[PDB]
Amino acid sequence: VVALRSRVIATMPGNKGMASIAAPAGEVRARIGDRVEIAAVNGPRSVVVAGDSDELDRLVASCTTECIRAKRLAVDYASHSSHVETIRDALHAELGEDFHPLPGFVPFFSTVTGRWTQPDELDAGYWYRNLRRTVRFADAVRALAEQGYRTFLEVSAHPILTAAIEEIGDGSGADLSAIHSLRRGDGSLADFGEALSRAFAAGVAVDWESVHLGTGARRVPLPTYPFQRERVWLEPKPVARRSTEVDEVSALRYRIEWRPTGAGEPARLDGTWLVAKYAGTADETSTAAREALESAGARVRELVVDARCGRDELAERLRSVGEVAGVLSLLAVDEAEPEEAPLALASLADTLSLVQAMVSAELGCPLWTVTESAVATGPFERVRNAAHGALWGVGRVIALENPAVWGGLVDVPAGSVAELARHLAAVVSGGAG
Amino acid sequence: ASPTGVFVGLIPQEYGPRLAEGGEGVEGYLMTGTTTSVASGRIAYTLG
């Protein structure tokens, strides 16, 4: 069909040609004239035109000033018109002598009718009607959308019509997909694979069990689906007799339930972060905290503070180093209560002196106090030292005096320093609050 | 001590007091009561 059609049609050139523009059907159907007619609406903003020479070329020139698809077809010829209708033998029946019309099968889509129809003038006189009537391709694309069709694959070597299939959805509420065909200039399997990819992306069902048969590939362990987890927990109605224990009075006591919070948002720190502590014993706590402190972006500086060494000593030391982005008080780690007095805890005094030294050092950086099971998120053990919570006590007050100087407290388990390395960098720099 | 399967089909439902709060006399047996698990093993235990 195509060979004989093209063969005979090779004589009409010199009289009429073809053009394909993406102008809206309104203006061109208004300004067409002198043996010029629209060969195929391929969208509300796309119309192929079949008109005589010296006016079809001027149609392209007008659309170049309309800043719209304007290409003089080098394959220009006669179709959808009368210059080809006269051949009621070669261009009407000789092309297709044998034909076997198919039944329902998978719904195809004819256009010269504007709807899905499989007549006997498809296998036989479809070209009779093609070189006679228009194509009304847009009407059939609307019918495709009406019959549930949205991804359009352009069987070609360059997008000219999927480009126009996207002006189908530039004014239609059913915005439809139009996988970008191999670009003008693309002719290799690298670009075909890039198309198969965007076909899958757009929604085209790809039988991937066909692309990988000649490859002789193997299946290897890959990560499973990352379920994006909500917190869908149903708290029971009769929890311990639907109350704390035995019934309820009109008054209501509050309680502290440590809720799993964020470890903070890790920001690359700067300046220095002082690991302020004692010097009595060697501390693996320091080596574990610092390994994520200079890796936090700052540098690590020790500040050996002694029991009531002075409300000022730490101040001039902090001024000696210079600007600090915050300090890590590791003086309240693995430290017994002096059995003389719980509130005479060596650390509490040094924490207070350090706080007021930063206040007097005009440094303005948030102080963090690492404590060793001073408190507990959950009763799984016994509070290692009730005196240590004293710091926590005054800690909850320090922020109400100096929000800039007080960062907070970071409780860590008794003995283990892994939690420091795992979280301190994010915790001290955390925007969680 | 004979090979004799017991295949009971039940539904969890809710019988006693919520195990978290336990009970007064039914404290260690509340679990052994509200479990379709032992609703086939209890039978295979009594008969052997």
Added chain:
Amino acid sequence: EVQLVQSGGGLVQPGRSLRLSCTASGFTFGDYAMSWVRQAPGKGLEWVGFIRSKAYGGTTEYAASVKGRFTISRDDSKSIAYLQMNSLKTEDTAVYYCTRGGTLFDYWGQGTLVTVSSASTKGPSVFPLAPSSAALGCLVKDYFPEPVTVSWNSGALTSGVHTFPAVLQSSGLYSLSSVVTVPSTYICNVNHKPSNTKVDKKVEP
């Protein structure tokens, strides 16, 4: 699995030499005694012959109809059974099978359609069947060989369509008479594949 896959059918004129190969994969070829059972189109099976196992002597027993004409062989190192069909006549148009047992036919293979006809490849002589006053049909007389396929309304009507199995004349040609039954103006397109001659038929009383 055992699979006795065959090969070697085709079209010849009476008095030719044709080869029938039986590829045996799945069993020890040398233990069984392969046999070749003929089934002329649409009648009962007739046993052509069988070669004994190499360990059973290898004596080949043939029919009375094909003694002195056909000879059967076997090879283990190449693991193929042979029906060597020499001096064929019109009777050999048939679906020859290869079973894996002289007295106990087993796998049977698939079915090698061998045809011995004196005809040549010509398209159909599509002759319509006008209704009496009813059903509407159309002949396909004088075509050769089989394949053949006939639709109605070009594969649109499938209910009531009866494509009568083909028929051999004494001239070596074939004749299908495909007929639909529906009260009415219908079309029948016959496509003789070997010659690619698609003829179409419009019928009225």
